[PDB]
Amino acid sequence: GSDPNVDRINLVILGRDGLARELANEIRALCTNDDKYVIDGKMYELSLRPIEGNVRLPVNSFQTSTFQPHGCLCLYNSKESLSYVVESIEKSRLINLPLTLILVNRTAHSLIQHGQQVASKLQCVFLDAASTGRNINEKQISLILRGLLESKRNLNL
Ligand code: NA
Ligand code: NA
Ligand code: NA
């Protein structure tokens, strides 16, 4: 269970073709051995749920009996991986869940254009981390996590 003295972030990471595993691995490299992530000198419990396959399947559901999601980090770098994000979100709709759509490193014009329309439709923030492996800068990870903590307090997640 969650330590009542340490704030918990339950983060879904959504991305096919190994995108979710890769970002989850990066984030865990930044964590303590008991999965704490430090922000502004403060410890947070960080639970990660990387998803790459069909979210219809129980094993791939956003929410489980011990995991209530607080946000979802959506990753893509291609037509197919963008399509996977839309399919997964619209199908598992989790609707007021804070979402972040991130374009990562692997056409460039169309991926940005479509990403922005998808983010508009899903009502979420769009970040271009491709210019910035298929990783994301750790400072950007911390910004997203800070944002989730405030959302968590506003939406009572
Ligand atoms: Na807690
Ligand atoms: Na976890
Ligand atoms: Na996990």
Residue numbers in the entry: 585 to 677, 688 to 700, 708 to 733, 738 to 762
The paper states:
The p190RhoGAP proteins, p190RhoGAP-A (ARHGAP35) and p190RhoGAP-B (ARHGAP5), are key regulators of Rho GTP hydrolysis and are highly important for maintenance of proper Rho signaling. They share over 50% sequence identity and a domain organization containing a GTP-binding GTPase domain, four FF domains and a C-terminal GAP domain. We identify two GTPase-like folds in the middle domain of both p190RhoGAP-A and -B which we term pG1 and pG2, and show that they are important for GAP activity toward RhoA. Thus, we classify p190RhoGAP pG1 and pG2 as psuedoGTPases.
We obtained crystals of the p190RhoGAP-A and p190RhoGAP-B pG1 domains that diffract to 1.9 and 2.6 Å resolution, respectively. The root mean square deviation (r.m.s.d.) between the two pG1 structures is 1.8 Å over 128 Cαs, and 2.7 Å (135 Cαs) between the prototypical small GTPase H-Ras and p190RhoGAP-A pG1. All five G motifs are degraded in p190RhoGAP pG1. In p190RhoGAP, helix α1 (which follows the P-loop) is extended and sterically occludes the phosphate-binding cavity. Switch I (G2) is completely absent in p190RhoGAP pG1 due to an 11-residue deletion. Switch II (G2) is also degraded in p190RhoGAP pG1, and places a glutamate side chain (Glu636) where the γ-phosphate of GTP binds to canonical small GTPases. The G4 and G5 motifs are disordered in our structures, but their sequence divergence suggests degraded ability to bind guanine base, and in our structures the guanosine-binding site appears to be sterically hindered by the side chains of Glu606 and Arg739, which form a predicted salt bridge with one another. Together, the substantially degraded G motifs in the p190RhoGAP pG1 domain indicate an inability to bind nucleotide. Consistent with our biochemical studies, co-crystallography of p190RhoGAP-A pG1 with GTPγS and Mg2+ yields no conformational differences and no electron density corresponding to bound nucleotide. Additionally, reported binding partners of p190RhoGAP such as Rnd3 may bind the pG1–pG2 region and affect p190RhoGAP activity. Interestingly, a conserved surface on p190RhoGAP-A pG1 is observed potentially suggesting a protein interaction surface.
